[PDB]
Amino acid sequence: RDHRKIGKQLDLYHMQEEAPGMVFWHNDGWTIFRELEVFVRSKLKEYQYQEVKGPFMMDRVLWEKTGHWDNYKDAMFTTSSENREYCIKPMNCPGHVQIFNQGLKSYRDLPLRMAEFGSCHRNEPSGSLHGLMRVRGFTQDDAHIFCTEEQIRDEVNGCIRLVYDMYSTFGFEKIVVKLSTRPEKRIGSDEMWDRAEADLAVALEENNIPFEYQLGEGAFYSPKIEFTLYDCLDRAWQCGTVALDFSLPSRLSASYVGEDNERKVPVMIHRAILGSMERFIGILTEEFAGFFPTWLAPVQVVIMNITDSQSEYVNELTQKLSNAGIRVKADLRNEKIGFKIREHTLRRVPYMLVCGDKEVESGKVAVRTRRGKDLGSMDVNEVIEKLQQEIRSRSLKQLEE
Amino acid sequence: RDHRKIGKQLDLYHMQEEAPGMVFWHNDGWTIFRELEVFVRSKLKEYQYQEVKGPFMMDRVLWEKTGHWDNYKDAMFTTSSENREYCIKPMNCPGHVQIFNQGLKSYRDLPLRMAEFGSCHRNEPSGSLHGLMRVRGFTQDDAHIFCTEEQIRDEVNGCIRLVYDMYSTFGFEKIVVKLSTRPEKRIGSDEMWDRAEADLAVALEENNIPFEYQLGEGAFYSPKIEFTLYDCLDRAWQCGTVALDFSLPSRLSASYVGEDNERKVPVMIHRAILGSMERFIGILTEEFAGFFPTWLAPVQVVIMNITDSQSEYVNELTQKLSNAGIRVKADLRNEKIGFKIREHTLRRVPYMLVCGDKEVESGKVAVRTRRGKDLGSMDVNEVIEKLQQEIRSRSLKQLEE
Ligand SMILES: [Zn+2]
Ligand SMILES: [Zn+2]
Secondary structure (H helix, E strand, O other), X not given: OOHHHHHHHOOOEEOOOOOOOOOEEOHXXXXXXXXXXXXXXXXXXXXXXXXXXXXXXXXXXXXXHHOHHHHOOOOEOEEEOOOOEEEEOOOOHHHHHHHHHOOOXXXXXXXXXXXXXXXXXXXXXXXXXXXXXXXXXXXXXXXXXXXXXXXXXXXXXXXXXXXXXXXXXXXXXXXXXXEEOOOOOOOOOHHHHHHHHXXXXXXXXXXXXXXXXXXXXXXXXXXXXXXXXXXXXXXXXXXXXXXXXXXXXXXOOOOEEOOOOOEXXXXXXXXXXXXXXXXXXXXXXXXOOOOOOHHHOXXXXXXXXXXXXXXXXXXXXXXXXXXXXXXXXXXXXXXXXXXXXXXXXXXXXXXXXXXXXXXXXXXXXXXXXXXXXXXXXXXXXXXXXXXXXXXXXXXXXXXXX | OOHHHHHHHOOOEEXXXXXXXXXEEOHHHHHHHHHHHHXXXXXXXXXXXXXXXXXXXXXXXXXXXXXXXXXXXXXOEXXXXXXXXXXXXXXXXXXHHHXXXXXXXXXXXXXXXXXXXXXXXXXOOOOOOEOOOEOOEEEEEEEEEEEOOOOHHHHXXXXXXXXXXXXXXXXXXXXXXXXXXXXXXXXXOHHHHHHHHHHHHHHHHHOOOOEEEEOOXXXXXXXXXXXXXXXXXXXXXXEEEEEEEOOHHHXXXXXXXXXXXXXXXXXXXXXXXXXXXXXXXXXXXXXHOOOOOOOOOOOOXXXXXXXXXXXXXXXXXXXXXXXXXXXXXXXXXXXXXXXXXXXHHHOOOOEEEEEOHHHXXXXXXXXXXXXXXXXXXXXXXXXXXXXXXXXXXXXXXXXXX
């Protein structure tokens, strides 16, 4: 159940010494990554977010103003051009404040939710790297909510709904929640931390979530709620984070015009459900042991043929299933039919369609799954509808499974 | 008509001094970018390309084995970690070969078409940076085809088909083709250079494409066909690129087992239709002067009420259209109906739905386009149905013109 072993077997990704801690996504692995984007983008529309894209490196003067430079200078990549030093972004927080700062905003623009699939780069030690779990180049499903102080409860409640909503799609139902409090090197007065810590504590209790206090483990700018999910091996994975930041928007001079026509600093809420999506794919690879659900499968259907008589019929089927929105390959190789079926069974292709002379003259197809489950002959349109339902619903279990 | 003024007016993007030549894509601009990605991915499916992803930095040693370091080392960014120098990738070619090298390849795996929306960073002088046309961080629609010598004539013909297929969607019909020959600073044998240059000219003749040679304007490793398009102002924009490479696969130790069971070095084709997608968005911005086709419009439909009586009926339509996959926004401000239409016309929204009490009872809408035309009262399901066809077909023309 090692993702590195399964990743090599299914041709999902690879890593090499020339880029330590950075992933070479192959076609099948990228399909999973992009399909996770589609699911996340589906939730961003449902929860009414904005998707933006910031630049990959910015001037060091920005990271000095946030205080990130004074704290994580060793963990950042630096580069220079025209006697100016730039940092490859390890976080999307300052980049989102820049977008919010363009054009005067009013209180009617809030709550303004801003998400991004930002690719970040942290200079982790090479000895600390392990597969997809600990990488240098990662992509966080970051988002920052700009809202007023009266809107904190409603925004955090929406974030908590999203944390459990997205985890339930993958089957993760056991979740442990912590609450990281102020550390010994922080910014912002005590009374700001007091109100921030109490805000997250109340929202956790109003959501009927039992939580423990991780004292001193919060970020230097905000206290955070940490969600830890458990896989089928009962292993704890810390993925979700929700923070309450009253300081960084002020340090970057973010302002909005309130109802009293007074300049006010907006509240910033950092949140990430999956965390590092590279790491989340590694968790899913081990959680399902390569048996990804149909909607996440790199190759959803393979249509083979027994002889060259059914070569035309398979091509007609591959075209039709593709137009229905199904990731389908056609295997017209010159091999034994038992050799083809085994290859795709090892590739964990959820469904494999076999076309003999009987299938062509009957207008049907024989279906077997990657589990050895044999479904027999089914009408072509019947199969298409069942795959469309299993993909739209993002169901975890297959047909007859 | 300058894309920077139109970009600021439509809230598409912005740039600042802290990131020279690097774009802050706002929400509406990023919607255009992603809609381009969807269109390109639709072409990748039709033309049967793979989509992969590579790391954003790699060891300087890898960039030295290709000669990329020798040619443009002043155009690269460099960063260091644990006494190892890494270069932020300005090209996606080395990353794809590393993916190709992983795993044993035979002749049966060719042609291997591998595409990527790679984020590149070139260290351009700040005096040359202009808007979106000249940037430091750009996203190319790169693709590399690994094929045998016999497959060259078909694979290059496939690229030429793709170039004219994609440009037809945007209405560009005046394409000017050049063939960049070898430069005086180059690598590879003369005999290899003549095979590649002659093959490109033959491929253009087979498609009945008039072209001129361009001496010395080719890459150090391959000759390339350069596609230049003309906008409605008759200005030449060089976007397309198809190169025939005999040099880099040999240098990066890429090989495939042939039919003779003897290892052979594959032929590489570098393909790029749109080029820099930030630059393409800028060209489209000036070509349409902000009147993006409905399939690219950040906000396709705006629904407005004449008074507070129609507030609820407007919201039902906003939800009904949103479920139909249309980018619909509701305008419920307390402003005269003429003021709303004038504002959203300046925002170049394709369609504007006005809802009076006559519309609430009849269940219909009043359609007004950004061109000042009036389409009268139409059934809501009829408006949705025709709007969907205009998007799925990526039609340049709007309704009733
Ligand atoms: Zn953040
Ligand atoms: Zn290339």
